[PDB]
Amino acid sequence: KVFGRCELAAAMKRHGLDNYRGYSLGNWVCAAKFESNFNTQATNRNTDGSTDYGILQINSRWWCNDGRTPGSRNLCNIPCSALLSSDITASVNCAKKIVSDGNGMNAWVAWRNRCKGTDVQAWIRGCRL
Ligand SMILES: [Br-]
Ligand SMILES: [Cl-]
Numbered sequence: 001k002v003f004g005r006c007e008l009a010a011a012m013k014r015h016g017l018d019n020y021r022g023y024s025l026g027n028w029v030c031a032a033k034f035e036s037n038f039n040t041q042a043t044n045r046n047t048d049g050s051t052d053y054g055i056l057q058i059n060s061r062w063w064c065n066d067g068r069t070p071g072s073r074n075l076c077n078i079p080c081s082a083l084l085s086s087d088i089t090a091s092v093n094c095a096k097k098i099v100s101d102g103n104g105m106n107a108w109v110a111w112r113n114r115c116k117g118t119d120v121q122a123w124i125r126g127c128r129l
């Protein structure tokens with residue numbers, strides 16, 4: 001499913017991401033825009049053989065099982081495919097684990113390079129939230 005900007009912002013808020021570990025909704029919407037252009041089915045293969053999945057492009061080396069990333073963990077206890085669902089619940093729950101990991105949203109390279117320090121509130125402007 002390709003979310004609308006405000007549609008995703010509402011979904012993320014409903015699932016408790018707004019100010020989760022101190023990160024305002026704009027930050028999560030911005031991260032999703034640049035990770036996946038709001039497409040739950042987005043996937044990208046990494047040089048190391050791992051693959052990133054979903055709206056927030058969560059990686060199979062640590063966080064989900066895809067059956068093809070040798071000697072990886074599955075800290076979110078999910079198949080990576082769950083991260084491609086029109087229902088963002090598994091992506092949200094796994095993202096909460098990741099942002100809790102110690103580097104906050106710096107876990108998402110695109111967040112650090114494209115969102116951090118910017119006016120991220122822009123990403124929820126005009127939304128009924
Ligand atoms: Br509020
Ligand atoms: Cl947009």
Ligand SMILES: [Cl-]
Pocket residue numbers: 024025026027120121122124
């Ligand atoms: Cl915000």
Ligand SMILES: [Cl-]
Pocket residue numbers: 049050051060066068069
């Ligand atoms: Cl993979």
Ligand SMILES: [Cl-]
Pocket residue numbers: 057058059063098107
């Ligand atoms: Cl990741």
Ligand SMILES: [Cl-]
Pocket residue numbers: 068
């Ligand atoms: Cl394969």
Ligand SMILES: [Cl-]
Pocket residue numbers: 051068
């Ligand atoms: Cl593959």
Ligand SMILES: [Cl-]
Pocket residue numbers: 065066067068069070071072
């Ligand atoms: Cl594997």
Ligand SMILES: [Cl-]
Pocket residue numbers: 069070071072
């Ligand atoms: Cl393995």
Ligand SMILES: [Cl-]
Pocket residue numbers: 011086087088089
């Ligand atoms: Cl949803």
Ligand SMILES: [Cl-]
Pocket residue numbers: 021098099100101102103104105
């Ligand atoms: Cl953290």
Ligand SMILES: [Cl-]
Pocket residue numbers: 021022103104105
């Ligand atoms: Cl932090």
Ligand SMILES: [Cl-]
Pocket residue numbers: 128129
């Ligand atoms: Cl409201």
Ligand code: NA
Pocket residue numbers: 060061062063064065066069072073074
């Ligand atoms: Na894995």
Ligand code: NA
Pocket residue numbers: 064065066067068069070072073
């Ligand atoms: Na695996």
